[PDB]
């Protein structure tokens, strides 16, 4: 009851994987509910999040044209559908999920197992969807 | 949506409520509401009156009662952020943040202090980000 989104992101995502970034944002407007970052070239922006939210909801295939832009970095898409987008930049992995109302995204540090990242993000997405979030 | 699930699954799990409502403070637009055997539906008009009163002249609640769902609560505490009332064995707690109005009332005999804690903690969550 009444816990902060920042605590939730830090706990549910960032304590479970070695992240370069982690963000929970609103699916309508790309408004950041909470985010954590390590040393990104640029801060994650509302614009970046709105573009992702709009794309995953309207045309996930669109990520094949130009990639996935977050934190001033470009990830090349490896999977795209309405609920799940995955990409890679070098040995860093990105996983993005859409629930009813939010977008969840996290990218790992170079070399961290992508499968762990994906499982954590996707499990948390599922939990949230089951609670109507 | 998410607000209705929050009310049902969180607030109403931790408080035995006769009613709960989350509303916009500026227009009294309902984000989510729950009702258990109220005489009438909670209306935007009821919410707008409360929003206006808690913001402008909270002493107005002593004058005009607190009207929700066709029920009348009698005010026991009033300031700009927090209004409390009673009707029989039922307690009402109302909180205003910058942009939201929160209200819940208990079923007969449920601890008012739990009511107040839950409502007030949700107000705090919102005020933490200036909502």
């Amino acid at each position: 009851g009444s816990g902060s989104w920042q605590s939730y992101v830090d706990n549910q995502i960032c304590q479970h994987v070695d992240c370069r970034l982690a963000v929970i944002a609103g699916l309508q407007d790309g408004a950041v509910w909470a985010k954590f970052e390590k040393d990104l070239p640029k801060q994650i922006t509302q614009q970046e999040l709105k573009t992702i939210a709009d794309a995953i909801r309207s045309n996930p295939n669109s990520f094949l044209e130009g990639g996935i832009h977050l934190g001033g970095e470009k990830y090349i898409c490896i999977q795209a559908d309405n609920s799940l987008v995955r990409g890679r930049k070098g040995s860093s992995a990105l996983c993005i999920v859409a629930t009813n109302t939010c977008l969840l995204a996290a990218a790992t540090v170079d070399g961290f197992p992508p499968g762990q990242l994906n499982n954590v993000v996707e499990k948390l997405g599922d939990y949230l969807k089951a609670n109507n979030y | 949506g998410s607000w209705q699930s929050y009310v049902d699954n969180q607030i109403c799990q931790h408080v035995d409520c006769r009613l709960a409502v989350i509303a916009g403070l500026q227009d009294g637009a309902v984000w989510a509401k729950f009702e258990k055997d109220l005489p009438k539906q909670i209306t935007q008009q009821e919410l707008k009156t409360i929003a206006d009163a808690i913001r402008s002249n909270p002493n107005s609640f002593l004058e005009g009662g607190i009207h929700l769902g066709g029920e009348k609560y009698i005010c026991i505490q009033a300031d700009n952020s927090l209004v409390r009332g009673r009707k029989g064995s039922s307690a009402l707690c109302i909180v205003a943040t910058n942009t939201c109005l929160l209200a819940a009332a208990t079923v007969d005999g449920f601890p008012p202090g739990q009511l107040n804690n839950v409502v007030e903690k949700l107000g705090d969550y919102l005020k933490a980000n200036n909502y």
Partner: peptide, 6 residues
């Protein structure tokens, strides 16, 4: 504004 985490 979003509700708290479930």
């Amino acid at each position: 504004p979003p509700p708290p985490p479930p």
